Design a protein around this ligand. Structure first.
Ligand SMILES: [La+3]
Length: 17
């Protein structure tokens, strides 16, 4: 995956790239 807000985790309700 490529994390939009660059922490490398997926968070609930975070915007997907
Ligand atoms: La994130």
């Amino acid at each position: 995956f490529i994390d939009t807000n660059n922490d490398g985790w997926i968070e609930g309700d975070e915007l997907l790239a």
